[PDB]
Each structure stands twice: as structure tokens, then as C-alpha cells.
């Protein structure tokens, strides 16, 4: 008995992180990955600093001393083989503690910044050591682009699974078709906390709006009329952090929210704030509203609140998925 699972969703929604979690839970190369973690660290710092002068209004440094470090960073930005001298980590760490640089980080939804930013910048001292050994949470946070189709095999209770990872960016979608045939189920991953951001491909179309469109385009596809989709509302942690902060309002992007109220059948996690519950469920209903409109009886949709970089959550959620595949004899 083998299950062919396919992972879909827009770019940077956390698909590759899910497959990684399968490796950790159900299935050496670390030294090869260190080079990648360092790139993310560099990429993150040079992006924040470069956007400070291009915002409206522009953000000003809290220390004129730092202007010199800023110049350094920009000077070594587009360098091919960067050897990462010990000065680089010092300069990086200094800027990261500057208020001007930090306030610019607050308004990061206005430009393009990787998700593992704050995580890597908070542990520069740890990464600078030449005897650095990447933890498992480090390997999960590390961001790298996917170009092509990758097959991952594994077993759970003597049961076989074949996971397929694909690139979510527009140009990498033309390859998806090569998996549509003979697929047990689809896993549509969405970035729940990306309601205030725009896609990299054009710097205009709303991230979540792109997620909704792509999902509707997948749900009503001509070659997937009998293929059930397991919906992963990923990035729940960042969503809460945003909702509670109160700076970026949801009803300022999606006006329909002002009319939405929490359902009676809602299951809030213990201690969870009403506001968080209401937001996380609002996004769920937006995706269900689309799936509910058609395909009656043929195939089904199963929502899930997810946080990919959380092995604990993933272990639980994938166990709920193994159930769906068996109950419905997929």
C-alpha cells in the first residue's frame, strides 16, 4: 500500500519545511548546510539596511556611528565568493541592535524580507564560531529556493508514502502537471500570516489573495475533480503575533472581516485570545467558501491549523492526515 502525496501552494508558504519535518519524524549533511544558513544571515541584514532609505517616510539611524557599518554592508553586498571574515559578524550584530534598523524591521511588510530573519539575527554569536553545529530548528528555519520536483520516500507503521515537493513561484508552476496523474491526495499550503504582504513576482498582488486565487484554480481544475485536498493554514504563530500587536489591521486589507464573527462550532486552544481565534478562523472560512461552492460529493477539503517549523505540531497534524487517507480509503 503506497500513497502518492503532492504539495502545492504559493512561493515561501512553507512546503519544503513540511517535507523536512517528515525526515525528522519518520526518516551527516549538516556541514553542507552551514554555508546556506550563513547566506540567509547575510541576505537578511543587507535587505533591511538597503530599504531604510527607500521607504516613505524614510527611517533614520539612532547612531551616526552605524552609518559606516551600513556602508560596509552595501560594499560587500553583491560579492560572489564571500569568505565571511570575523568583522562581518561584528558589523551585522551592531546594526541589528540599532533602533533605526530595528524600526525598519517593524515595517518589513513594505518590502521583501525572508522569514528566518529575526531568528538568525538573534543568534549571530552562535553562528560566528567555526565549531558551529546547526541545531534541528536551524535546519528548519533555513530558507532555500526549490526548482524542480523532488521525491521523498518513507514509512509509517509499515505504510508507504511518496512525497512530492514543487516550487510555488509562478514560473515553477508549469511543472505541477507532471504529478496530477495518479495522486492519492494534495496538500495545499498557505501563509496565513501574509495578509499584509505582496508577492515577489510583481510587488503588487496581495500574498493571501494570490493564495486564494491559486487554491480556487486548483480546486476547480479539470484533472483534479475527484482529488481531495488537505488544507494547511500554515504560519499560525506569526499570525497571532501580528493580530495581538495591533499595528497592521486585517480589515484594512480584507474589508469583509468587519462583518465576520466567530462560529459556534469553533474550537479555541486553551488560553487563546478571542481576537486570535476570530482572525485564524476568518482565513479558514475564506478558503472554505471557495471549496464549498462546487465539486459536490466528488472530492473533499480538510482544513488544519499549522506551524511547519514546529515538529510537535507537525507530528500531530500528519497523524490526523494519515487518518483521513484511511477513513476515506484513499
Amino acid at each position: 500500500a503506497t500513497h502518492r502525496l503532492l504539495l502545492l501552494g504559493a512561493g515561501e508558504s512553507g512546503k519544503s519545511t513540511i517535507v523536512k519535518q517528515m525526515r525528522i519524524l519518520h526518516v551527516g549533511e549538516k556541514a553542507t548546510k552551514v554555508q546556506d544558513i550563513k547566506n540567509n544571515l547575510k541576505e537578511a541584514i543587507e535587505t533591511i539596511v538597503a530599504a531604510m532609505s527607500n521607504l516613505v517616510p524614510p527611517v533614520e539611524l539612532a547612531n551616526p556611528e552605524n552609518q559606516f557599518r551600513v556602508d560596509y554592508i552595501l560594499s560587500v553586498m553583491n560579492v560572489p565568493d564571500f569568505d565571511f571574515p570575523p568583522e562581518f559578524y561584528e558589523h551585522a550584530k551592531a546594526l541589528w541592535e540599532d533602533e533605526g534598523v530595528r524600526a525598519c524591521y517593524e515595517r518589513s511588510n513594505e518590502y521583501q524580507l525572508i522569514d528566518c530573519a529575526q531568528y538568525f539575527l538573534d543568534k549571530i554569536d552562535v553562528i560566528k564560531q567555526d565549531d558551529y553545529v546547526p541545531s534541528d530548528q536551524d535546519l528548519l528555519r533555513c530558507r532555500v529556493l526549490t526548482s524542480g520536483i523532488f521525491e521523498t520516500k518513507f514509512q509509517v507503521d509499515k505504510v508507504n508514502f511518496h512525497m512530492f515537493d514543487v516550487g510555488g513561484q509562478r514560473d515553477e508552476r508549469r511543472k505541477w502537471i507532471q504529478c496530477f496523474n495518479d495522486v492519492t491526495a494534495i496538500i495545499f499550503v498557505v501563509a496565513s500570516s501574509s495578509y499584509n504582504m505582496v508577492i515577489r513576482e510583481d510587488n503588487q498582488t496581495n500574498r493571501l489573495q494570490e493564495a486564494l486565487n491559486l487554491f480556487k484554480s486548483i480546486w476547480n481544475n479539470r484533472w483534479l475533480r475527484t482529488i481531495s485536498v488537505i488544507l494547511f493554514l500554515n504560519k499560525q504563530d506569526l499570525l497571532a503575533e501580528k493580530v495581538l500587536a495591533g499595528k497592521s489591521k486585517i480589515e484594512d486589507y480584507f474589508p469583509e472581516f468587519a462583518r465576520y464573527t466567530t462560529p459556534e462550532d469553533a474550537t479555541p486552544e486553551p488560553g487563546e485570545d478571542p481576537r486570535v481565534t476570530r482572525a485564524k478562523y476568518f482565513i479558514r472560512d475564506e478558503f472554505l467558501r471557495i471549496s464549498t461552492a462546487s465539486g459536490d460529493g466528488r472530492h473533499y477539503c480538510y482544513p488544519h491549523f499549522t506551524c511547519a517549523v514546529d515538529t510537535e505540531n507537525i507530528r500531530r497534524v500528519f497523524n490526523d492526515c494519515r487518518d483521513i487517507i484511511q477513513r476515506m480509503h484513499l
Binding site: 496530477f180 496523474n181 479539470r222 484533472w223 483534479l224 475533480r225 475527484t226
Partner: protein, 189 residues
């Protein structure tokens, strides 16, 4: 099902031969559409006859492009030799037609060996065909071939067991595809 049933199957270890006429577009400009077809019928009839003898399965005719394969549908270890022997008979047949007719018919022959997918596509008007990079290459061997000579790749030579004497084809310098893909060509004597 959401995908139309596909009528295709894979086959490893097979040989593909291509044959095309020189200046065919130019030739069709001189003689009548009626006469031209006769010279083509005279030529392709003999071709089809020799194919059955040499255990080669004819695929289809794309105007002046004739192509057949050996090793289908039933496997055979004699496959490479069959296609070589095929061209041997073809090249000779072309001479006869050119002699008994007067028309200037000359053809290039191309051969390569490997795996291919075969079957039919669509709903209306089925016609057995083949597809694969190995087929694309065989087609390019014909383009980079030489008039009245058999052009073959290194992969085909390995299935010949050293029976026919060959020589450097320099196919790399005649066709960009052969060069860009690092191919070693050879010619028959």
C-alpha cells in the same frame, strides 16, 4: 478518470533510422505534382518491402522523410545490424530509381540506438509513432548526415559488435545539436 486513457508503452534497446531527400522543396518546383508523387511512390514502395525482410518496422512518411525502427514490437538483439543492413538496401534502391527515372533523388541516412516510447495520440486519425530524446537525436543524425552514406552514433556502434568497418564522421561540425550534446559520429564503408 480525468485524463484520457493513454495508448503508449516504453521500450529499451532499440534502433532508429531516418532517411530524407536532398532539395526536395526545390525538386517539387520543377516536375508536376503528379509526376513527383510517382517517383516518391516508386521509391517508398521498395523501401517498405525491404523493411519487412530486414525485420524493421516502418513508422511513417513525413513528405520526403522516411523512418523505421528495429526492435519493435518484440525485442531483438540483432536490432542494430538490421538498421545498418536496411540503409545498405535503401541507398542502393535510391540509385536504381534515379537511374530508371532520371530524377535527381539523393538521400541521407541517420541511425542511433536507445529507448523510445511508442503508440498513438489524440482521438481522431491514429497513426503509430515514437517519441524520446533518442529519437530526436536520430532525426538530427539525418540532418548531419552525408548524401548516399550511413551516418551513425557511438551508441549504435556498440551494438554492432565490430562487423562493419567505420570511419570518423565529424558529425559535430555539420550539426549544432550533435556538437552541443557531445556526440561522436561514424560513417559506414
Amino acid at each position: 478518470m480525468m485524463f484520457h486513457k493513454i495508448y503508449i508503452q516504453k521500450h529499451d534497446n532499440v534502433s532508429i533510422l531516418f532517411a530524407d531527400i536532398e532539395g526536395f522543396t526545390s525538386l517539387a518546383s520543377q516536375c508536376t505534382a503528379q509526376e513527383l508523387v510517382m517517383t516518391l511512390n516508386e521509391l517508398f514502395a521498395r523501401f517498405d518491402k525491404l523493411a519487412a525482410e530486414n525485420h524493421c518496422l516502418r513508422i511513417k512518411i513525413l513528405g520526403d522523410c522516411y523512418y523505421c525502427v528495429s526492435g519493435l514490437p518484440e525485442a531483438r538483439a540483432d536490432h542494430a545490424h538490421c538498421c545498418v543492413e536496411m540503409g545498405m538496401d535503401m541507398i542502393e534502391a535510391i540509385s536504381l530509381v534515379r537511374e530508371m527515372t532520371g530524377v535527381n533523388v539523393n538521400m541521407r541516412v541517420g541511425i542511433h540506438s536507445g529507448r523510445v516510447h511508442c503508440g498513438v495520440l489524440g482521438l481522431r486519425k491514429w497513426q503509430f509513432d515514437v517519441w524520446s530524446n533518442d529519437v530526436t537525436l536520430a532525426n538530427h543524425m539525418e540532418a548531419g548526415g552525408k548524401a548516399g552514406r550511413i551516418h551513425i552514433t557511438k551508441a549504435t556502434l556498440s551494438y554492432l559488435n565490430g562487423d562493419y568497418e567505420v570511419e570518423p564522421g565529424c558529425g559535430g561540425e555539420r550539426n549544432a545539436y550533435l556538437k552541443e550534446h557531445s556526440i561522436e559520429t561514424f560513417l559506414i564503408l
